[PDB]
Amino acid sequence: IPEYVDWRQKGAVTPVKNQGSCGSCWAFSAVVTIEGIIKIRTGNLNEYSEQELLDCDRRSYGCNGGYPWSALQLVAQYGIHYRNTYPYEGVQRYCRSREKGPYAAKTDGVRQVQPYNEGALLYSIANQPVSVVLEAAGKDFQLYRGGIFVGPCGNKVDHAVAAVGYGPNYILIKNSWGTGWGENGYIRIKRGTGNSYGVCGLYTSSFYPVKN
Numbered sequence: 046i047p048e049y050v051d052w053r054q055k056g057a058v059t060p061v062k063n064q065g066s067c068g069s070c071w072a073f074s075a076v077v078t079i080e081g082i083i084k085i086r087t088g089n090l091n092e093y094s095e096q097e098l099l100d101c102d103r104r105s106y107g108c109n110g111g112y113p114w115s116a117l118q119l120v121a122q123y124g125i126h127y128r129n130t131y132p133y134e135g136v137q138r139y140c141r142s143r144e145k146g147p148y149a150a151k152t153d154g155v156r157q158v159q160p161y162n163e164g165a166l167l168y169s170i171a172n173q174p175v176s177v178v179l180e181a182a183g184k185d186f187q188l189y190r191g192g193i194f195v196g197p198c199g200n201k202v203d204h205a206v207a208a209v210g211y212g213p214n215y216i217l218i219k220n221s222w223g224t225g226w227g228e229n230g231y232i233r234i235k236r237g238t239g240n241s242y243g244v245c246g247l248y249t250s251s252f253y254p255v256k257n
């Protein structure tokens with residue numbers, strides 16, 4: 046795998062979103078990986094519905110948090126609508142998949158990256174955008190304005206984001222806190238510290254969709 050990966054450079058990343066006060070990060074994280082793999086497989090970049098996952102993933106707890114892997118399982122088992130047809134409201138409502146016609150995209154499964162393994166995550170990122178979790182509760186992460194982020198932070202993961210690239214010293218992350226946060230909505234998180242958790246627990250729980 047190469048020294049630099051940036052899926053934005055290959056037109057596989059849609060504009061930065063803002064999840065608002067709703068604990069829907071898990072749905073935003075999942076959708077970034079779907080938008081990525083559909084572009085890589087079909088050559089078309091589309092936006093897909095975070096709201097649909099928020100409403101329809103019965104394993105997750107709507108705006109009270111959820112599971113990127115369960116969201117990705119749902120897209121593999123059923124599918125997902127375009128964001129345009131099922132737009133984001135920042136509140137959990139009834140699952141309205143049936144009322145919005147046939148699904149726009151479908152995947153063939155979900156895979157976990159070997160956890161607590163930097164090389165395993167970089168290998169997956171080289172192939173496609175990956176759903177990752179980290180500790181975002183800390184003020185340092187909340188007030189991040191740019192540069193390579195080293196913390197401070199603990200490993201108490203509480204927030205799902207998407208790894209869309211890496212460099213020699215960092216992993217490139219798409220956050221769902223709008224374009225005003227960090228580097229136009231992105232964070233470069235320090236890698237290669239030798240801490241198996243990753244910086245802010247970045248290696249705790251990572252999933253990517255499978256599509257043939």
Ligand SMILES: *[C@@H](O)[C@H](Cc1ccccc1)NC(=O)[C@@H](NC(=O)[C@@H](NC(=O)N[C@H](Cc1ccc(O)cc1)C(=O)O)[C@@H]1CCN=C(N)N1)C(C)C
Binds near residue numbers: 069111
């Ligand atoms: C992002 O907007 C939200 C914010 C939030 C966090 C906690 C409570 C409310 C809102 N963050 C999340 O959705 C996070 N989700 C969780 O913390 C998640 N737990 C896990 O991801 N861990 C599981 C463990 C597990 C696996 C399978 C079953 O059946 C049970 C448990 C894992 O290791 O995969 C849950 C979601 C519901 N509430 C809490 N507290 N935790 C982030 C995605 C990590």
